[PDB]
Amino acid sequence: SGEVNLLDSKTIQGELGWISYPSHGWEEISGVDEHYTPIRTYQVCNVMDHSQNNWLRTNWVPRNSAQKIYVELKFTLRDCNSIPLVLGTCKETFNLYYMESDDDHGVKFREHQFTKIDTIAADESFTQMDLGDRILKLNTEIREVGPVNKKGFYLAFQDVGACVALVSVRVYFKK
Amino acid sequence: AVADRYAVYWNSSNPRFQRGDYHIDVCINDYLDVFCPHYEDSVPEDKTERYVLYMVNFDGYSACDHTSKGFKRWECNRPHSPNGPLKFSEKFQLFTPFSLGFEFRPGREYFYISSAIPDNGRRSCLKLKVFVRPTNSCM
Ligand SMILES: *[C@@H]1O[C@H](CO)[C@@H](O[C@@H]2O[C@H](CO)[C@@H](O)[C@H](O)[C@H]2NC(C)=O)[C@H](O)[C@H]1NC(C)=O
Ligand SMILES: [Ca+2]
Numbered sequence: 149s150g151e152v153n154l155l156d157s158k159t160i161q162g163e164l165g166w167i168s169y170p171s172h173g174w175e176e177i178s179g180v181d182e183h184y185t186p187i188r189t190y191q192v193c194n195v196m197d198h199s200q201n202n203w204l205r206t207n208w209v210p211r212n213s214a215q216k217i218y219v220e221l222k223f224t225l226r227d228c229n230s231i232p233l234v235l236g237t238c239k240e241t242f243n244l245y246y247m248e249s250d251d252d253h254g255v256k257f258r259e260h261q262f263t264k265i266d267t268i269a270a271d272e273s274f275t276q277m278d279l280g281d282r283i284l285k286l287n288t289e290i291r292e293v294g295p296v297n298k299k300g301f302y303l304a305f306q307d308v309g310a311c312v313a314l315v316s317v318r319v320y321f322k323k
Numbered sequence: 324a325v326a327d328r329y330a331v332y333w334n335s336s337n338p339r340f341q342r343g344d345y346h347i348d349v350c351i352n353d354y355l356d357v358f359c360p361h362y363e364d365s366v367p368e369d370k371t372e373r374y375v376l377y378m379v380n381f382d383g384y385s386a387c388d389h390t391s392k393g394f395k396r397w398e399c400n401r402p403h404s405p406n407g408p409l410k411f412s413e414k415f416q417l418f419t420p421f422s423l424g425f426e427f428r429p430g431r432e433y434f435y436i437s438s439a440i441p442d443n444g445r446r447s448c449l450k451l452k453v454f455v456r457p458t459n460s461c462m
Contacts, residue, residue, distance in 0.1 A: 160404065160406050161405070161406070164406070171324045172324055172326065172352070175414050176412055177412050177413065177414050177421075177424075178396065178411045178413065179421050179423065179424065180395075180423055186395070186396070186397050186398050186411075188412070189421065191420050191421060191424075192420065193416065193418055193419070193420040195418075196417070224420065224421050224422045224423075225420065226418070226420050226422075231418055232418070233417065233418070274422040278422045279419070279422060279424075282423060284422055284423055285422045286422075311418065311420040312420050313419070313420040313422075315421075
């Protein structure tokens with residue numbers, strides 16, 4: 149009976165305190181959403197580079213007393229065949245992780261501390277034709293955050309060689 | 324890190340927009356950050372500078388026309404925005420992972436203009452030219 153956002157990447161505050169590791173991986177780049185509102189998006193496309201392991205971590209998110217936590221992802225993903233320069237093998241998936249924590253600051257980022265929720269695939273990948281005709285090939289994927297037995301958690305996105313634009317990340321519970 | 328980041332404060336009080344020849348030379352994978360006008364909350368809406376930022380071709384850049392040949396990139400209609408000025412971010416990458424994104428090539432020129440809010444009929448628009456340098460000049 150109503151949703152309550154814990155995190156919204158489209159709000160000014162919601163997009164603060166995110167960290168990329170390493171730099172030049174996930175980038176903070178202006179884009180637009182499905183409502184024609186200019187927003188901050190999170191993008192990665194290092195297919196002209198070798199051995200990619202790019203992480204993007206959100207700010208700390210409280211769980212409150214909520215039981216079931218959902219994460220809603222809106223993203224565009226490029227068809228590997230539509231990319232003129234590919235040095236290795238391009239991927240068309242990316243990974244969603246989480247890590248529980250009581251602390252919202254002073255937490256050194258460690259990949260091995262993160263639990264994988266799912267591998268994220270696109271129902272529709274876009275091509276040069278979509279680029280040329282200005283088509284918004286938006287994918288929507290909803291997942292649930294695993295057991296959170298701390299005060300809150302961090303979410304993380306892992307890229308291993310895909311061409312992915314995260315248009316929207318929204319974490320919420322229902323009342 | 325290795326790339327360079329450029330900050331452009333896009334308002335009519337910036338003397339770099341004066342002659343209409345404001346340009347920057349960037350490399351592929353460089354960053355451009357454009358900041359919207361920002362004011363103390365005590366300043367009324369009507370006395371604040373607001374606009375839409377467009378990427379246009381050379382013709383649109385010359386004539387200050389975004390209609391036939393332009394794409395909206397950013398909206399500066401929050402002069403009192405929390406956490407400071409609204410910030411448009413661009414990365415000059417070869418290939419976009421965003422189906423409505425923009426791609427850049429070494430050796431080419433790109434153009435931005437702004438259209439005021441509320442709309443006047445002026446043709447004295449603020450504008451910026453971006454030259455993406457050849458690969459040889461960027462190591
Ligand atoms: C309009 O633009 C000027 C710059 O031309 C802005 O002043 C700069 O603000 C930044 C960040 O606050 C400082 O680091 C610079 O030193 C300032 N001036 C210069 C000379 O670069 C000014 O804030 C803008 N005005 C509005 C209304 O936002
Ligand atoms: Ca120059």
